[PDB]
PDB file of all heavy atoms in Angstrom:
ATOM      1  N   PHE A  47     -11.741  19.223  -9.509  1.00 48.66           N
ATOM      2  CA  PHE A  47     -12.049  18.035 -10.363  1.00 48.66           C
ATOM      3  C   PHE A  47     -12.327  16.834  -9.571  1.00 48.66           C
ATOM      4  O   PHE A  47     -13.422  16.084  -9.796  1.00 48.66           O
ATOM      5  CB  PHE A  47     -10.727  17.761 -11.095  1.00 48.66           C
ATOM      6  CG  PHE A  47     -10.782  16.578 -12.043  1.00 48.66           C
ATOM      7  CD1 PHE A  47     -11.464  16.577 -13.213  1.00 48.66           C
ATOM      8  CD2 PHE A  47      -9.961  15.429 -11.823  1.00 48.66           C
ATOM      9  CE1 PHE A  47     -11.450  15.511 -14.091  1.00 48.66           C
ATOM     10  CE2 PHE A  47      -9.988  14.433 -12.665  1.00 48.66           C
ATOM     11  CZ  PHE A  47     -10.732  14.384 -13.824  1.00 48.66           C
ATOM     12  N   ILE A  48     -11.689  16.533  -8.476  1.00 47.97           N
ATOM     13  CA  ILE A  48     -11.931  15.464  -7.518  1.00 47.97           C
ATOM     14  C   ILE A  48     -13.335  15.730  -6.840  1.00 47.97           C
ATOM     15  O   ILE A  48     -14.130  14.852  -6.803  1.00 47.97           O
ATOM     16  CB  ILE A  48     -10.760  15.272  -6.524  1.00 47.97           C
ATOM     17  CG1 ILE A  48      -9.584  14.576  -7.268  1.00 47.97           C
ATOM     18  CG2 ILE A  48     -11.210  14.319  -5.371  1.00 47.97           C
ATOM     19  CD1 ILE A  48      -8.273  14.784  -6.554  1.00 47.97           C
ATOM     20  N   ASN A  49     -13.524  16.943  -6.354  1.00 47.96           N
ATOM     21  CA  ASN A  49     -14.707  17.217  -5.656  1.00 47.96           C
ATOM     22  C   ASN A  49     -15.993  17.188  -6.496  1.00 47.96           C
ATOM     23  O   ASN A  49     -17.061  16.872  -5.966  1.00 47.96           O
ATOM     24  CB  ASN A  49     -14.658  18.556  -4.944  1.00 47.96           C
ATOM     25  CG  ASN A  49     -13.816  18.666  -3.723  1.00 47.96           C
ATOM     26  OD1 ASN A  49     -14.044  17.871  -2.809  1.00 47.96           O
ATOM     27  ND2 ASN A  49     -12.854  19.643  -3.685  1.00 47.96           N
ATOM     28  N   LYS A  50     -15.885  17.571  -7.741  1.00 47.83           N
ATOM     29  CA  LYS A  50     -16.959  17.614  -8.625  1.00 47.83           C
ATOM     30  C   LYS A  50     -17.393  16.175  -9.081  1.00 47.83           C
ATOM     31  O   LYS A  50     -18.618  15.869  -9.134  1.00 47.83           O
ATOM     32  CB  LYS A  50     -16.593  18.549  -9.994  1.00 47.83           C
ATOM     33  CG  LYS A  50     -17.767  18.835 -10.728  1.00 47.83           C
ATOM     34  CD  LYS A  50     -17.176  19.235 -12.193  1.00 47.83           C
ATOM     35  CE  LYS A  50     -18.285  19.340 -13.197  1.00 47.83           C
ATOM     36  NZ  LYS A  50     -19.147  20.490 -12.890  1.00 47.83           N
ATOM     37  N   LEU A  51     -16.393  15.334  -9.299  1.00 47.63           N
ATOM     38  CA  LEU A  51     -16.615  13.931  -9.512  1.00 47.63           C
ATOM     39  C   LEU A  51     -17.324  13.251  -8.332  1.00 47.63           C
ATOM     40  O   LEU A  51     -18.265  12.561  -8.517  1.00 47.63           O
ATOM     41  CB  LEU A  51     -15.316  13.236  -9.899  1.00 47.63           C
ATOM     42  CG  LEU A  51     -15.347  11.679 -10.146  1.00 47.63           C
ATOM     43  CD1 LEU A  51     -16.357  11.351 -11.251  1.00 47.63           C
ATOM     44  CD2 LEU A  51     -13.997  11.314 -10.471  1.00 47.63           C
ATOM     45  N   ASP A  52     -16.818  13.574  -7.137  1.00 45.50           N
ATOM     46  CA  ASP A  52     -17.506  13.104  -5.837  1.00 45.50           C
ATOM     47  C   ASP A  52     -17.668  11.573  -5.899  1.00 45.50           C
ATOM     48  O   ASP A  52     -18.719  11.120  -5.534  1.00 45.50           O
ATOM     49  CB  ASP A  52     -18.787  13.849  -5.635  1.00 45.50           C
ATOM     50  CG  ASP A  52     -19.206  13.962  -4.189  1.00 45.50           C
ATOM     51  OD1 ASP A  52     -18.268  13.863  -3.345  1.00 45.50           O
ATOM     52  OD2 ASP A  52     -20.367  14.191  -3.885  1.00 45.50           O
ATOM     53  N   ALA A  53     -16.646  10.787  -6.298  1.00 44.97           N
ATOM     54  CA  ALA A  53     -16.645   9.401  -6.395  1.00 44.97           C
ATOM     55  C   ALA A  53     -16.364   8.691  -5.064  1.00 44.97           C
ATOM     56  O   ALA A  53     -15.557   9.240  -4.278  1.00 44.97           O
ATOM     57  CB  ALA A  53     -15.762   8.906  -7.526  1.00 44.97           C
ATOM     58  N   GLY A  54     -16.911   7.538  -4.877  1.00 44.71           N
ATOM     59  CA  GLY A  54     -16.754   6.730  -3.712  1.00 44.71           C
ATOM     60  C   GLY A  54     -17.983   5.877  -3.395  1.00 44.71           C
ATOM     61  O   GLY A  54     -19.112   6.365  -3.671  1.00 44.71           O
ATOM     62  N   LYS A  55     -17.717   4.700  -2.842  1.00 41.87           N
ATOM     63  CA  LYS A  55     -18.798   3.796  -2.329  1.00 41.87           C
ATOM     64  C   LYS A  55     -19.499   4.574  -1.165  1.00 41.87           C
ATOM     65  O   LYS A  55     -18.890   4.970  -0.143  1.00 41.87           O
ATOM     66  CB  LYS A  55     -18.231   2.548  -1.779  1.00 41.87           C
ATOM     67  CG  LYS A  55     -19.243   1.502  -1.278  1.00 41.87           C
ATOM     68  CD  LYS A  55     -19.352   1.547   0.214  1.00 41.87           C
ATOM     69  CE  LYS A  55     -18.105   0.785   0.853  1.00 41.87           C
ATOM     70  NZ  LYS A  55     -17.741  -0.352   0.080  1.00 41.87           N
ATOM     71  N   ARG A  56     -20.830   4.916  -1.300  1.00 41.50           N
ATOM     72  CA  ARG A  56     -21.619   5.528  -0.317  1.00 41.50           C
ATOM     73  C   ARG A  56     -21.757   4.671   0.871  1.00 41.50           C
ATOM     74  O   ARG A  56     -21.697   3.377   0.790  1.00 41.50           O
ATOM     75  CB  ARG A  56     -22.936   5.932  -0.969  1.00 41.50           C
ATOM     76  CG  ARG A  56     -23.037   7.395  -1.459  1.00 41.50           C
ATOM     77  CD  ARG A  56     -22.120   7.660  -2.611  1.00 41.50           C
ATOM     78  NE  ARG A  56     -22.258   8.988  -3.091  1.00 41.50           N
ATOM     79  CZ  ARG A  56     -21.422   9.584  -3.951  1.00 41.50           C
ATOM     80  NH1 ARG A  56     -20.327   8.936  -4.349  1.00 41.50           N
ATOM     81  NH2 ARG A  56     -21.640  10.781  -4.372  1.00 41.50           N
ATOM     82  N   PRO A  57     -22.101   5.220   2.119  1.00 36.24           N
ATOM     83  CA  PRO A  57     -22.104   4.362   3.325  1.00 36.24           C
ATOM     84  C   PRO A  57     -23.279   3.333   3.292  1.00 36.24           C
ATOM     85  O   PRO A  57     -23.141   2.282   3.855  1.00 36.24           O
ATOM     86  CB  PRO A  57     -22.309   5.418   4.434  1.00 36.24           C
ATOM     87  CG  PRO A  57     -22.863   6.639   3.815  1.00 36.24           C
ATOM     88  CD  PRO A  57     -22.307   6.648   2.385  1.00 36.24           C
ATOM     89  N   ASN A  58     -24.380   3.713   2.663  1.00 36.36           N
ATOM     90  CA  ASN A  58     -25.530   2.749   2.531  1.00 36.36           C
ATOM     91  C   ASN A  58     -25.452   1.906   1.331  1.00 36.36           C
ATOM     92  O   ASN A  58     -26.415   1.475   0.743  1.00 36.36           O
ATOM     93  CB  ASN A  58     -26.874   3.633   2.446  1.00 36.36           C
ATOM     94  CG  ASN A  58     -27.087   4.455   3.703  1.00 36.36           C
ATOM     95  OD1 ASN A  58     -26.527   4.224   4.804  1.00 36.36           O
ATOM     96  ND2 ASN A  58     -28.022   5.363   3.600  1.00 36.36           N
ATOM     97  N   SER A  59     -24.247   1.678   0.807  1.00 35.00           N
ATOM     98  CA  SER A  59     -23.974   0.808  -0.219  1.00 35.00           C
ATOM     99  C   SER A  59     -22.812  -0.136   0.129  1.00 35.00           C
ATOM    100  O   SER A  59     -22.034   0.146   1.055  1.00 35.00           O
ATOM    101  CB  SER A  59     -23.443   1.731  -1.487  1.00 35.00           C
ATOM    102  OG  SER A  59     -23.198   0.997  -2.644  1.00 35.00           O
ATOM    103  N   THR A  60     -22.772  -1.264  -0.514  1.00 32.17           N
ATOM    104  CA  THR A  60     -21.777  -2.334  -0.185  1.00 32.17           C
ATOM    105  C   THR A  60     -20.775  -2.518  -1.399  1.00 32.17           C
ATOM    106  O   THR A  60     -19.948  -3.396  -1.310  1.00 32.17           O
ATOM    107  CB  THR A  60     -22.360  -3.603   0.336  1.00 32.17           C
ATOM    108  OG1 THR A  60     -23.085  -4.231  -0.772  1.00 32.17           O
ATOM    109  CG2 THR A  60     -23.292  -3.352   1.469  1.00 32.17           C
ATOM    110  N   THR A  61     -21.036  -1.884  -2.508  1.00 29.92           N
ATOM    111  CA  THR A  61     -20.272  -2.118  -3.645  1.00 29.92           C
ATOM    112  C   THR A  61     -19.024  -1.138  -3.833  1.00 29.92           C
ATOM    113  O   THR A  61     -19.224   0.020  -4.069  1.00 29.92           O
ATOM    114  CB  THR A  61     -21.132  -1.926  -4.980  1.00 29.92           C
ATOM    115  OG1 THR A  61     -22.295  -2.689  -4.863  1.00 29.92           O
ATOM    116  CG2 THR A  61     -20.319  -2.346  -6.261  1.00 29.92           C
ATOM    117  N   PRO A  62     -17.769  -1.686  -3.759  1.00 30.88           N
ATOM    118  CA  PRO A  62     -16.541  -0.942  -3.974  1.00 30.88           C
ATOM    119  C   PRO A  62     -16.596  -0.539  -5.432  1.00 30.88           C
ATOM    120  O   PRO A  62     -17.104  -1.177  -6.364  1.00 30.88           O
ATOM    121  CB  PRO A  62     -15.388  -1.917  -3.671  1.00 30.88           C
ATOM    122  CG  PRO A  62     -16.027  -3.053  -2.951  1.00 30.88           C
ATOM    123  CD  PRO A  62     -17.488  -3.147  -3.429  1.00 30.88           C
ATOM    124  N   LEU A  63     -15.960   0.728  -5.759  1.00 29.07           N
ATOM    125  CA  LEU A  63     -15.724   1.105  -7.155  1.00 29.07           C
ATOM    126  C   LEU A  63     -14.397   0.610  -7.570  1.00 29.07           C
ATOM    127  O   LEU A  63     -13.469   0.544  -6.852  1.00 29.07           O
ATOM    128  CB  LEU A  63     -16.004   2.615  -7.241  1.00 29.07           C
ATOM    129  CG  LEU A  63     -17.272   3.255  -6.796  1.00 29.07           C
ATOM    130  CD1 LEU A  63     -17.302   4.748  -6.994  1.00 29.07           C
ATOM    131  CD2 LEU A  63     -18.385   2.668  -7.633  1.00 29.07           C
ATOM    132  N   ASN A  64     -14.274   0.420  -8.903  1.00 27.11           N
ATOM    133  CA  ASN A  64     -12.948   0.173  -9.584  1.00 27.11           C
ATOM    134  C   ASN A  64     -12.556   1.326 -10.411  1.00 27.11           C
ATOM    135  O   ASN A  64     -13.031   1.529 -11.463  1.00 27.11           O
ATOM    136  CB  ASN A  64     -13.039  -1.124 -10.309  1.00 27.11           C
ATOM    137  CG  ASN A  64     -13.316  -2.290  -9.360  1.00 27.11           C
ATOM    138  OD1 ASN A  64     -12.830  -2.486  -8.378  1.00 27.11           O
ATOM    139  ND2 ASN A  64     -14.190  -3.263  -9.848  1.00 27.11           N
ATOM    140  N   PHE A  65     -11.631   2.146  -9.902  1.00 24.78           N
ATOM    141  CA  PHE A  65     -11.078   3.296 -10.541  1.00 24.78           C
ATOM    142  C   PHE A  65      -9.906   2.910 -11.495  1.00 24.78           C
ATOM    143  O   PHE A  65      -9.033   2.040 -11.069  1.00 24.78           O
ATOM    144  CB  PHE A  65     -10.455   4.256  -9.489  1.00 24.78           C
ATOM    145  CG  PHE A  65     -11.494   4.997  -8.670  1.00 24.78           C
ATOM    146  CD1 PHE A  65     -12.068   4.434  -7.463  1.00 24.78           C
ATOM    147  CD2 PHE A  65     -11.827   6.359  -8.934  1.00 24.78           C
ATOM    148  CE1 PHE A  65     -12.935   5.113  -6.729  1.00 24.78           C
ATOM    149  CE2 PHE A  65     -12.716   7.014  -8.130  1.00 24.78           C
ATOM    150  CZ  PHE A  65     -13.289   6.357  -7.051  1.00 24.78           C
ATOM    151  N   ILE A  66      -9.823   3.580 -12.605  1.00 25.56           N
ATOM    152  CA  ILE A  66      -8.652   3.590 -13.372  1.00 25.56           C
ATOM    153  C   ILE A  66      -8.151   5.095 -13.593  1.00 25.56           C
ATOM    154  O   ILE A  66      -8.981   5.967 -13.944  1.00 25.56           O
ATOM    155  CB  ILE A  66      -8.715   2.719 -14.666  1.00 25.56           C
ATOM    156  CG1 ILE A  66      -7.385   2.656 -15.382  1.00 25.56           C
ATOM    157  CG2 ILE A  66      -9.871   3.234 -15.470  1.00 25.56           C
ATOM    158  CD1 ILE A  66      -7.168   1.447 -16.319  1.00 25.56           C
ATOM    159  N   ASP A  67      -6.903   5.338 -13.356  1.00 24.18           N
ATOM    160  CA  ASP A  67      -6.337   6.635 -13.592  1.00 24.18           C
ATOM    161  C   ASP A  67      -5.134   6.513 -14.539  1.00 24.18           C
ATOM    162  O   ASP A  67      -4.252   5.719 -14.217  1.00 24.18           O
ATOM    163  CB  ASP A  67      -5.896   7.366 -12.265  1.00 24.18           C
ATOM    164  CG  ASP A  67      -5.255   8.728 -12.394  1.00 24.18           C
ATOM    165  OD1 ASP A  67      -5.968   9.665 -12.959  1.00 24.18           O
ATOM    166  OD2 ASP A  67      -4.029   8.810 -12.149  1.00 24.18           O
ATOM    167  N   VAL A  68      -5.265   7.283 -15.595  1.00 25.99           N
ATOM    168  CA  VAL A  68      -4.259   7.127 -16.684  1.00 25.99           C
ATOM    169  C   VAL A  68      -3.239   8.333 -16.868  1.00 25.99           C
ATOM    170  O   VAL A  68      -3.694   9.451 -16.764  1.00 25.99           O
ATOM    171  CB  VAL A  68      -4.990   6.904 -18.101  1.00 25.99           C
ATOM    172  CG1 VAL A  68      -4.034   6.703 -19.252  1.00 25.99           C
ATOM    173  CG2 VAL A  68      -6.000   5.830 -17.925  1.00 25.99           C
ATOM    174  N   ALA A  69      -2.015   8.010 -17.151  1.00 25.55           N
ATOM    175  CA  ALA A  69      -1.032   8.898 -17.514  1.00 25.55           C
ATOM    176  C   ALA A  69      -0.676   9.997 -16.257  1.00 25.55           C
ATOM    177  O   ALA A  69      -0.320  11.106 -16.564  1.00 25.55           O
ATOM    178  CB  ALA A  69      -1.297   9.664 -18.802  1.00 25.55           C
ATOM    179  N   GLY A  70      -0.882   9.553 -15.123  1.00 27.24           N
ATOM    180  CA  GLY A  70      -0.589  10.295 -13.873  1.00 27.24           C
ATOM    181  C   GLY A  70       0.218   9.459 -12.896  1.00 27.24           C
ATOM    182  O   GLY A  70      -0.157   9.489 -11.683  1.00 27.24           O
ATOM    183  N   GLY A  71       1.124   8.674 -13.351  1.00 26.19           N
ATOM    184  CA  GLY A  71       1.816   7.723 -12.591  1.00 26.19           C
ATOM    185  C   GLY A  71       2.337   8.099 -11.291  1.00 26.19           C
ATOM    186  O   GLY A  71       2.514   7.288 -10.360  1.00 26.19           O
ATOM    187  N   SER A  72       2.684   9.384 -11.011  1.00 21.06           N
ATOM    188  CA  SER A  72       3.223   9.846  -9.757  1.00 21.06           C
ATOM    189  C   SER A  72       2.153   9.665  -8.781  1.00 21.06           C
ATOM    190  O   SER A  72       2.399   9.339  -7.485  1.00 21.06           O
ATOM    191  CB  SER A  72       3.564  11.337  -9.913  1.00 21.06           C
ATOM    192  OG  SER A  72       2.395  12.076 -10.109  1.00 21.06           O
ATOM    193  N   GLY A  73       0.843   9.800  -9.174  1.00 17.39           N
ATOM    194  CA  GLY A  73      -0.256   9.484  -8.269  1.00 17.39           C
ATOM    195  C   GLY A  73      -0.947  10.635  -7.671  1.00 17.39           C
ATOM    196  O   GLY A  73      -1.597  10.493  -6.634  1.00 17.39           O
ATOM    197  N   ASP A  74      -0.672  11.883  -8.205  1.00 17.60           N
ATOM    198  CA  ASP A  74      -1.237  12.988  -7.559  1.00 17.60           C
ATOM    199  C   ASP A  74      -2.819  12.958  -7.531  1.00 17.60           C
ATOM    200  O   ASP A  74      -3.366  13.046  -6.484  1.00 17.60           O
ATOM    201  CB  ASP A  74      -0.929  14.185  -8.458  1.00 17.60           C
ATOM    202  CG  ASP A  74      -1.099  15.439  -7.680  1.00 17.60           C
ATOM    203  OD1 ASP A  74      -2.138  15.719  -7.129  1.00 17.60           O
ATOM    204  OD2 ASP A  74      -0.143  16.228  -7.761  1.00 17.60           O
ATOM    205  N   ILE A  75      -3.410  12.518  -8.630  1.00 17.26           N
ATOM    206  CA  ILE A  75      -4.841  12.474  -8.797  1.00 17.26           C
ATOM    207  C   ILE A  75      -5.424  11.214  -8.189  1.00 17.26           C
ATOM    208  O   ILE A  75      -6.400  11.232  -7.566  1.00 17.26           O
ATOM    209  CB  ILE A  75      -5.234  12.667 -10.186  1.00 17.26           C
ATOM    210  CG1 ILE A  75      -5.084  14.216 -10.568  1.00 17.26           C
ATOM    211  CG2 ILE A  75      -6.607  12.178 -10.493  1.00 17.26           C
ATOM    212  CD1 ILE A  75      -6.184  14.967 -10.132  1.00 17.26           C
ATOM    213  N   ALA A  76      -4.756  10.033  -8.394  1.00 20.06           N
ATOM    214  CA  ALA A  76      -5.296   8.814  -7.938  1.00 20.06           C
ATOM    215  C   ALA A  76      -5.292   8.820  -6.431  1.00 20.06           C
ATOM    216  O   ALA A  76      -6.258   8.391  -5.822  1.00 20.06           O
ATOM    217  CB  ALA A  76      -4.342   7.712  -8.397  1.00 20.06           C
ATOM    218  N   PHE A  77      -4.290   9.187  -5.734  1.00 22.72           N
ATOM    219  CA  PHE A  77      -4.229   9.287  -4.263  1.00 22.72           C
ATOM    220  C   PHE A  77      -5.338  10.245  -3.676  1.00 22.72           C
ATOM    221  O   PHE A  77      -5.959   9.907  -2.692  1.00 22.72           O
ATOM    222  CB  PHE A  77      -2.885   9.802  -3.798  1.00 22.72           C
ATOM    223  CG  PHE A  77      -1.705   8.960  -4.082  1.00 22.72           C
ATOM    224  CD1 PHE A  77      -0.530   9.430  -3.976  1.00 22.72           C
ATOM    225  CD2 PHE A  77      -1.868   7.687  -4.591  1.00 22.72           C
ATOM    226  CE1 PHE A  77       0.574   8.702  -4.257  1.00 22.72           C
ATOM    227  CE2 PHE A  77      -0.867   6.885  -4.883  1.00 22.72           C
ATOM    228  CZ  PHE A  77       0.379   7.344  -4.770  1.00 22.72           C
ATOM    229  N   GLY A  78      -5.654  11.286  -4.438  1.00 21.30           N
ATOM    230  CA  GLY A  78      -6.562  12.292  -3.966  1.00 21.30           C
ATOM    231  C   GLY A  78      -8.027  11.791  -4.136  1.00 21.30           C
ATOM    232  O   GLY A  78      -8.851  12.038  -3.419  1.00 21.30           O
ATOM    233  N   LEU A  79      -8.171  10.920  -5.166  1.00 18.75           N
ATOM    234  CA  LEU A  79      -9.409  10.295  -5.459  1.00 18.75           C
ATOM    235  C   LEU A  79      -9.781   9.298  -4.377  1.00 18.75           C
ATOM    236  O   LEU A  79     -10.827   9.383  -3.691  1.00 18.75           O
ATOM    237  CB  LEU A  79      -9.511   9.553  -6.797  1.00 18.75           C
ATOM    238  CG  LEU A  79      -9.660  10.575  -7.930  1.00 18.75           C
ATOM    239  CD1 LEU A  79      -9.296   9.840  -9.267  1.00 18.75           C
ATOM    240  CD2 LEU A  79     -11.094  11.150  -8.024  1.00 18.75           C
ATOM    241  N   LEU A  80      -8.830   8.516  -3.889  1.00 19.19           N
ATOM    242  CA  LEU A  80      -8.912   7.530  -2.894  1.00 19.19           C
ATOM    243  C   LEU A  80      -9.027   8.248  -1.524  1.00 19.19           C
ATOM    244  O   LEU A  80      -9.912   7.849  -0.628  1.00 19.19           O
ATOM    245  CB  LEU A  80      -7.767   6.512  -2.817  1.00 19.19           C
ATOM    246  CG  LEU A  80      -7.714   5.541  -3.982  1.00 19.19           C
ATOM    247  CD1 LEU A  80      -6.407   4.680  -3.889  1.00 19.19           C
ATOM    248  CD2 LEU A  80      -8.991   4.736  -4.135  1.00 19.19           C
ATOM    249  N   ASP A  81      -8.332   9.324  -1.299  1.00 17.50           N
ATOM    250  CA  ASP A  81      -8.488  10.124  -0.067  1.00 17.50           C
ATOM    251  C   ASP A  81      -9.779  10.673   0.135  1.00 17.50           C
ATOM    252  O   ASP A  81     -10.447  10.659   1.198  1.00 17.50           O
ATOM    253  CB  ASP A  81      -7.459  11.262  -0.074  1.00 17.50           C
ATOM    254  CG  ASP A  81      -6.062  10.845   0.286  1.00 17.50           C
ATOM    255  OD1 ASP A  81      -5.776   9.631   0.651  1.00 17.50           O
ATOM    256  OD2 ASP A  81      -5.140  11.634   0.052  1.00 17.50           O
ATOM    257  N   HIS A  82     -10.395  11.242  -0.993  1.00 16.94           N
ATOM    258  CA  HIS A  82     -11.720  11.887  -1.001  1.00 16.94           C
ATOM    259  C   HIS A  82     -12.775  10.836  -0.645  1.00 16.94           C
ATOM    260  O   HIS A  82     -13.734  11.193   0.008  1.00 16.94           O
ATOM    261  CB  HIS A  82     -11.982  12.506  -2.359  1.00 16.94           C
ATOM    262  CG  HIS A  82     -13.320  13.143  -2.465  1.00 16.94           C
ATOM    263  ND1 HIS A  82     -13.576  14.383  -1.821  1.00 16.94           N
ATOM    264  CD2 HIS A  82     -14.511  12.845  -3.167  1.00 16.94           C
ATOM    265  CE1 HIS A  82     -14.855  14.683  -2.214  1.00 16.94           C
ATOM    266  NE2 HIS A  82     -15.400  13.690  -2.891  1.00 16.94           N
ATOM    267  N   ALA A  83     -12.601   9.634  -1.253  1.00 17.73           N
ATOM    268  CA  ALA A  83     -13.608   8.641  -1.028  1.00 17.73           C
ATOM    269  C   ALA A  83     -13.683   8.192   0.531  1.00 17.73           C
ATOM    270  O   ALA A  83     -14.771   8.010   1.108  1.00 17.73           O
ATOM    271  CB  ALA A  83     -13.298   7.455  -1.945  1.00 17.73           C
ATOM    272  N   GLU A  84     -12.497   8.108   1.102  1.00 19.07           N
ATOM    273  CA  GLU A  84     -12.363   7.732   2.523  1.00 19.07           C
ATOM    274  C   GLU A  84     -12.859   8.848   3.479  1.00 19.07           C
ATOM    275  O   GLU A  84     -13.655   8.525   4.365  1.00 19.07           O
ATOM    276  CB  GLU A  84     -10.947   7.362   2.860  1.00 19.07           C
ATOM    277  CG  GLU A  84     -10.677   7.001   4.257  1.00 19.07           C
ATOM    278  CD  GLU A  84      -9.257   6.564   4.534  1.00 19.07           C
ATOM    279  OE1 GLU A  84      -8.523   6.237   3.627  1.00 19.07           O
ATOM    280  OE2 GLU A  84      -8.855   6.506   5.760  1.00 19.07           O
ATOM    281  N   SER A  85     -12.366  10.040   3.352  1.00 17.39           N
ATOM    282  CA  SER A  85     -12.733  11.021   4.364  1.00 17.39           C
ATOM    283  C   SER A  85     -14.165  11.486   4.102  1.00 17.39           C
ATOM    284  O   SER A  85     -14.800  11.842   5.093  1.00 17.39           O
ATOM    285  CB  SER A  85     -11.930  12.389   4.003  1.00 17.39           C
ATOM    286  OG  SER A  85     -12.373  13.048   2.835  1.00 17.39           O
ATOM    287  N   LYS A  86     -14.825  11.446   2.888  1.00 17.49           N
ATOM    288  CA  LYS A  86     -16.164  11.837   2.758  1.00 17.49           C
ATOM    289  C   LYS A  86     -17.143  10.726   2.978  1.00 17.49           C
ATOM    290  O   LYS A  86     -18.309  10.965   3.518  1.00 17.49           O
ATOM    291  CB  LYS A  86     -16.409  12.469   1.387  1.00 17.49           C
ATOM    292  CG  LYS A  86     -17.699  13.256   1.302  1.00 17.49           C
ATOM    293  CD  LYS A  86     -17.908  13.941   0.013  1.00 17.49           C
ATOM    294  CE  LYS A  86     -19.255  14.650  -0.058  1.00 17.49           C
ATOM    295  NZ  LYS A  86     -19.467  15.450  -1.201  1.00 17.49           N
TER     296      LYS A  86
END
């Protein structure tokens, strides 16, 4: 799910994205989205 979305500010871009993640308060998916954006 995270990999297929492939979300994140690209390196040749200067615009941060504003994510909203709903009904996953523990943060499994939210943290993973942010991790993916940073590592990739």
Side-chain angles (χ1 to χ4, degrees):
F47 182 69
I48 290 162
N49 283 311
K50 190 198 170 69
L51 178 58
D52 209 20
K55 182 260 286 322
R56 266 64 176 166
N58 301 340
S59 180
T60 66
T61 310
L63 300 178
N64 298 317
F65 289 82
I66 187 156
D67 178 63
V68 182
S72 64
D74 202 308
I75 285 278
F77 298 167
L79 286 164
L80 293 178
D81 285 348
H82 180 75
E84 179 179 343
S85 79
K86 194 178 177 177

